[PDB]
């Protein structure tokens, strides 16, 4: 399958979703962060700090503009490199939720083998996995394999890839 | 269904026309907020001018179902659906409706399994003594507004299709057009069964040109 | 069938008759005031017996107070309780 | 009534060890963990119902019932005789109803 | 004769539907309530200094105050109680629509969605309801998988031989390197760019081990209880400590019991600065403390603001932020087991000091693993393994005043009461469940045992008896009324003399300014006449015994309403079911009664509610106060059904009776509520029957009140049933009653009041009603 670097749009959506502890679909792309976190002033500047040290440079007054053009303004400079937040969140996802012995290298290898996804798509499927964190502990290899399968399906359906 | 109809321009049809222009043309999303806003106007006009009055009205005061006692409700049913002149229920399905409501009252205010006081709805063919009998066995029902479940049950009985439509609007919601416009043709031929025997409430179909 | 059930630790002891006497009297006193027990009821004599069988100086003063502060003008049932009281206080004094 | 006490204990009259333990409990002193009583009466009305069991049906349940209603009533009495004798009690007999 | 001849014979059976009632206090005719109180009471009391319990609620092991009371007083559920329990526990849910083709309106099983008739609820769910309510084996699924039979710990081991290297990210490898120093080797992997971590010999690891803990039983809120069922949104549920949900439900349910469906209604009557929150906890959000002390240490994912959720003052903050939007006092006490009585003590004084006119008072505490374990280590709680050895079932492990009592049962929940000035309660037409006659706290003395119960609260019965030959004229209500009448004539003279002096001063002012001058000075003389009368009433009616050392605060509190020490019918005991507590509290109440000359043979009737609910700590007295008010307004005194055998030691306390069965009495006039916290927190409260208030007002004011209450009750029953069936009892305020521009204008005008907005239909502060002359 053709390589494709992760879109700032997907990364932004996954980071916001994960940070609010909400399903990747529940958050609509065309809404300001301020509307999503209306009350909590703490989670406001906490999401802004997370997007700061993810995408380096941030637009002036970013929290009262919808995620539509924020994705575009980041994408302009952003070059599909996971950065720090998403790398640390994926490490935590693997180490805190995997069978044991099944590391991120083995997950990526399993994606590359069975689904034939290169590093660009692997980053994307893993970000989708982060958005749907099993919030427990995958029991056996078979459970983790099935989980990665169901995540690869969702990723493919989001980006528009066939398997 | 949105078909044009020539009617005699009575107060009722004037009301109908007004609502067609101002309420029933509005899109489904803006219908309910407009009804809420205009509730007190809409209820006054129904009660003054139309052949289907606002049901929840006690001594001319515009209540709601939620703010009406079970006795107030039963007396309003007998006042709208039982003809004093002919000393009979206009429709037998209306008598059933009223009995169903009295049995619900006994169900809500009895402490243990008992016999209904209304054993056959034929007893309601003298409605005042039947009311007094039910609200003497259950005098708590004179003082308590309708349970939210009984409001829901009432509104459910008002949409029963194996029944002549109710001669009143019980609620302002998304189905206000159906409550207002359904079964509007019999009243002109049965003025005894209209609020004040007022023709000016009713819909009378008639050609503009044949009216010369 | 022959499984052992007995254990010393599971033995339950009842011996607080001094407390139950006052409860028994009070329950009677209110049952007569509420007209649950009438003057013809044999359970009024059974409860008398039970209160006499537990009589002491704490119970006698408990009865004296509750009976000598019953307002008989409040109803028939109050005159009935006050009459039966005064009798029961005499009985409980004789059987102390 | 005044000076009465009631002591409710769980007990299987079917069990020999329950019978020994119950009597040995009633007759132990308060320090050792018992009532430090000395029985004046024994009323052994423990029974289990046998209905429909004729001679050819006599089985486990009947043989058990017979241990509750005879054998272990002789063990209760025996135990009460052993305890009274042990404590040299010869003028306070326990009436068996 | 066919089947048509027997159809007219056949007759219809009416099955009952549950018609749940808010059990507002019954209001007698003025003629009957005038007889209970002395004739001198009318006009005597300053009703702005009389505190009343206007509304109450709880969340606890038996559901609500309604369901708890049925279980406490009657030992079994009614149709109403059973339906209410099934709704709370989530077994039934309302349905109004299409159900398998036919249109249905009623209860349906919440899993199958099959219709359920109210009559069938007891046959279908009562067994489940009883099995999963009250004091019962700890349910792990209610405490984040906590199982006292398998209690996780970690033991520090030293490595003896190197571990198989494991994969880790660069960051977490550096973190493993930073901690272990030279006892670990982290190497980058060139291929992929992550790191291998090898723990060497002498490295420190923590290996999980499971301890079997001996406290297996607790008073837990019924299984199924969900804040969503009352209408609390998922974004609140996620944010806050589970304790806060109990407080938020208790506070809306208390407001409903007060007939206040919209809290903003209060602001038609009082400024925003006059609604206080005086409620408190012993430990606050212990689930958040776990979060920040254990879950953070174990690198588990915890919300960043978990700190704020732990503070005891944060539950009252959420109540202000979501329901009340007041700017009134906020005084959060921390009294351990006496918290809820300290809360009433503070809230009474907050109102008597003029700072607030309404307080929310009460307490709340959670049950979690760490507190359960620590209570076991102090041997405060009953050891459940010993109770099984004694053949006790969980239901009969809390048994106060019993011979064999051996530690309290930990429970969880909240209890709230709304208190306010009688004057405002009558004016608003809210129900009145009881008068708070007295509320006090006491420490004990010099000692070295923080958990030791003491006798400091004995001081509420402190009286000089050196010279008691002649009864003081101060106790005689006629004398006090005669002195108030003398003073009322002198105030009348004083107002005549100020009004003539104002007329003399008006002539010097030019006629164009004379109107405004006379308005401004007449209002001031009105204010100062009100103030002087209220001070007379206060000095003769309410506070006749503050400067008297021959009148105990406890005696004076009852004498206010014409009652005597003999009229204190019921004493709700802390009664935890511990050796030291139950003797000490008996002994204390006994000394109070004996000192105040309580009649020989008139013991107070002990009520030990913790036999049913268990000891919820903070919330303990808030439950006892909710039961005291239910005792008063019913005359039913519940029995301690776990009082198998009253301790022989307690017999010496002749002024106390320990009943085992409910006594339906002909009226209770007053109830004492005693609590004894950890850290020498003794507390008492006296609640008087509400009918002793109405003796102090006139028939026209009484009849006005009775009409307002009747109306408010009807409105509240409508609110309650709607909210129940559509899961919207709780409705979070999105906006304050003022805008952010009006905020400072409303805060600085004491006579600003909310007005019905026509457009929205909601209660808002309009700009016209701020610094208005009207």
PDB file of C-alpha atoms in Angstrom, chain B residues 37 66-67 69-70 103-104 106-119 138 142-153 156, chain E residues 10-21 79-80 94-96 103-107 118 711 713-715 717-718 721-723 725-726 759:
ATOM      1  CA  UNK B  37     -43.436  32.077  22.978  1.00  0.00           C
ATOM      2  CA  UNK B  66     -49.936  19.486  34.815  1.00  0.00           C
ATOM      3  CA  UNK B  67     -51.648  22.210  36.962  1.00  0.00           C
ATOM      4  CA  UNK B  69     -56.602  18.373  39.695  1.00  0.00           C
ATOM      5  CA  UNK B  70     -58.186  15.004  38.728  1.00  0.00           C
ATOM      6  CA  UNK B 103     -60.752   4.163  36.336  1.00  0.00           C
ATOM      7  CA  UNK B 104     -57.193   5.655  36.123  1.00  0.00           C
ATOM      8  CA  UNK B 106     -59.286   5.011  41.196  1.00  0.00           C
ATOM      9  CA  UNK B 107     -56.045   3.152  40.174  1.00  0.00           C
ATOM     10  CA  UNK B 108     -53.867   6.166  41.260  1.00  0.00           C
ATOM     11  CA  UNK B 109     -55.655   6.813  44.622  1.00  0.00           C
ATOM     12  CA  UNK B 110     -56.522   3.283  45.904  1.00  0.00           C
ATOM     13  CA  UNK B 111     -54.139   1.672  48.462  1.00  0.00           C
ATOM     14  CA  UNK B 112     -55.199  -1.964  47.661  1.00  0.00           C
ATOM     15  CA  UNK B 113     -56.928  -4.114  44.979  1.00  0.00           C
ATOM     16  CA  UNK B 114     -60.675  -3.175  45.024  1.00  0.00           C
ATOM     17  CA  UNK B 115     -63.769  -3.208  42.745  1.00  0.00           C
ATOM     18  CA  UNK B 116     -64.244  -0.286  40.310  1.00  0.00           C
ATOM     19  CA  UNK B 117     -67.139   2.017  41.304  1.00  0.00           C
ATOM     20  CA  UNK B 118     -67.711   2.498  37.511  1.00  0.00           C
ATOM     21  CA  UNK B 119     -68.383  -1.219  36.675  1.00  0.00           C
ATOM     22  CA  UNK B 138     -60.926   9.172  46.583  1.00  0.00           C
ATOM     23  CA  UNK B 142     -59.829  16.643  44.486  1.00  0.00           C
ATOM     24  CA  UNK B 143     -56.634  18.325  45.823  1.00  0.00           C
ATOM     25  CA  UNK B 144     -53.756  16.798  43.804  1.00  0.00           C
ATOM     26  CA  UNK B 145     -52.620  17.917  40.307  1.00  0.00           C
ATOM     27  CA  UNK B 146     -52.303  15.201  37.641  1.00  0.00           C
ATOM     28  CA  UNK B 147     -49.395  12.786  38.161  1.00  0.00           C
ATOM     29  CA  UNK B 148     -46.941  13.264  35.234  1.00  0.00           C
ATOM     30  CA  UNK B 149     -47.722   9.615  34.229  1.00  0.00           C
ATOM     31  CA  UNK B 150     -51.491  10.359  34.075  1.00  0.00           C
ATOM     32  CA  UNK B 151     -50.761  13.474  31.919  1.00  0.00           C
ATOM     33  CA  UNK B 152     -48.861  11.190  29.503  1.00  0.00           C
ATOM     34  CA  UNK B 153     -51.669   8.580  29.715  1.00  0.00           C
ATOM     35  CA  UNK B 156     -52.071   8.956  24.750  1.00  0.00           C
TER      36      UNK B 156
ATOM     37  CA  UNK E  10     -68.342 -10.136  35.762  1.00  0.00           C
ATOM     38  CA  UNK E  11     -66.893  -7.072  37.610  1.00  0.00           C
ATOM     39  CA  UNK E  12     -63.695  -4.963  37.128  1.00  0.00           C
ATOM     40  CA  UNK E  13     -60.748  -5.075  39.618  1.00  0.00           C
ATOM     41  CA  UNK E  14     -58.791  -1.796  40.201  1.00  0.00           C
ATOM     42  CA  UNK E  15     -55.057  -2.469  40.873  1.00  0.00           C
ATOM     43  CA  UNK E  16     -53.233   0.322  42.753  1.00  0.00           C
ATOM     44  CA  UNK E  17     -50.613   2.535  41.020  1.00  0.00           C
ATOM     45  CA  UNK E  18     -47.828   3.997  43.206  1.00  0.00           C
ATOM     46  CA  UNK E  19     -48.697   7.631  44.002  1.00  0.00           C
ATOM     47  CA  UNK E  20     -45.472   8.753  45.744  1.00  0.00           C
ATOM     48  CA  UNK E  21     -46.048  11.719  48.119  1.00  0.00           C
ATOM     49  CA  UNK E  79     -46.003   0.092  46.980  1.00  0.00           C
ATOM     50  CA  UNK E  80     -44.679   3.695  46.841  1.00  0.00           C
ATOM     51  CA  UNK E  94     -40.445   5.038  32.606  1.00  0.00           C
ATOM     52  CA  UNK E  95     -41.589   4.634  29.009  1.00  0.00           C
ATOM     53  CA  UNK E  96     -44.072   6.800  27.063  1.00  0.00           C
ATOM     54  CA  UNK E 103     -48.747   2.530  22.585  1.00  0.00           C
ATOM     55  CA  UNK E 104     -47.505   2.149  26.231  1.00  0.00           C
ATOM     56  CA  UNK E 105     -47.255   4.626  29.130  1.00  0.00           C
ATOM     57  CA  UNK E 106     -45.655   3.321  32.340  1.00  0.00           C
ATOM     58  CA  UNK E 107     -42.771   1.521  34.051  1.00  0.00           C
ATOM     59  CA  UNK E 118     -46.700  -1.095  39.995  1.00  0.00           C
ATOM     60  CA  UNK E 711     -50.085  25.848  46.600  1.00  0.00           C
ATOM     61  CA  UNK E 713     -46.841  21.607  47.861  1.00  0.00           C
ATOM     62  CA  UNK E 714     -49.050  21.011  44.779  1.00  0.00           C
ATOM     63  CA  UNK E 715     -46.399  22.629  42.499  1.00  0.00           C
ATOM     64  CA  UNK E 717     -45.511  17.180  43.589  1.00  0.00           C
ATOM     65  CA  UNK E 718     -45.916  18.191  39.917  1.00  0.00           C
ATOM     66  CA  UNK E 721     -43.203  13.315  39.332  1.00  0.00           C
ATOM     67  CA  UNK E 722     -42.215  15.015  36.084  1.00  0.00           C
ATOM     68  CA  UNK E 723     -38.520  15.000  37.136  1.00  0.00           C
ATOM     69  CA  UNK E 725     -40.183   9.865  35.079  1.00  0.00           C
ATOM     70  CA  UNK E 726     -37.975  11.972  32.717  1.00  0.00           C
ATOM     71  CA  UNK E 759     -39.322  36.298  27.103  1.00  0.00           C
TER      72      UNK E 759
END
